[PDB]
Ligand binder design. Sequence first.
Ligand SMILES: *[C@@H]1O[C@H](CO)[C@@H](O[C@@H]2O[C@H](CO)[C@@H](O)[C@H](O)[C@H]2NC(C)=O)[C@H](O)[C@H]1NC(C)=O
Ligand SMILES: *[C@@H]1O[C@H](CO)[C@@H](O)[C@H](O)[C@H]1NC(C)=O
Lengths: 51, 50
Amino acid sequence: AFLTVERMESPIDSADDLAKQTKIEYGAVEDGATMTFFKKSKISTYDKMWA
Amino acid sequence: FMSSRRQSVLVKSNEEGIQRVLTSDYAFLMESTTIEFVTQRNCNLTQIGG
Ligand SMILES: *[C@@H]1O[C@H](CO)[C@@H](O[C@@H]2O[C@H](CO)[C@@H](O)[C@H](O)[C@H]2NC(C)=O)[C@H](O)[C@H]1NC(C)=O
Ligand SMILES: *[C@@H]1O[C@H](CO)[C@@H](O)[C@H](O)[C@H]1NC(C)=O
């Protein structure tokens, strides 16, 4: 039971795995070039990151 | 996605599109009749979804 939940954790590897877990907080430069990108994007992953 | 990823995931032919699935994790969208021809001639491919 130890060796099957110490594998079933799947640590963060992409923005897709980090689009779901709202425990780990997102972040951006305030009104820089990164914050401007997520505000205008229409991709399903990147719009949820702006939410 | 495809508007943002033009000339990256937008292949221009079916023969280079099936090969791109055969190389990387590619999920090519095409007509259902040709998929029923390729899957019966290639046992490393499948038709997922309706
Ligand atoms: C399933 O099988 C193989 C083995 O891990 C993976 O195929 C490799 O995928 C990488 C990623 O693009 C390529 O650079 C390699 O050339 C591939 N090698 C071969 C022999 O195909 C594949 O990614 C695996 N995972 C899937 C399909 O999710
Ligand atoms: C998939 O199957 C075909 C024929 O069965 C074979 O020629 C091809 O090399 C296979 N591809 C992989 C990645 O195993």
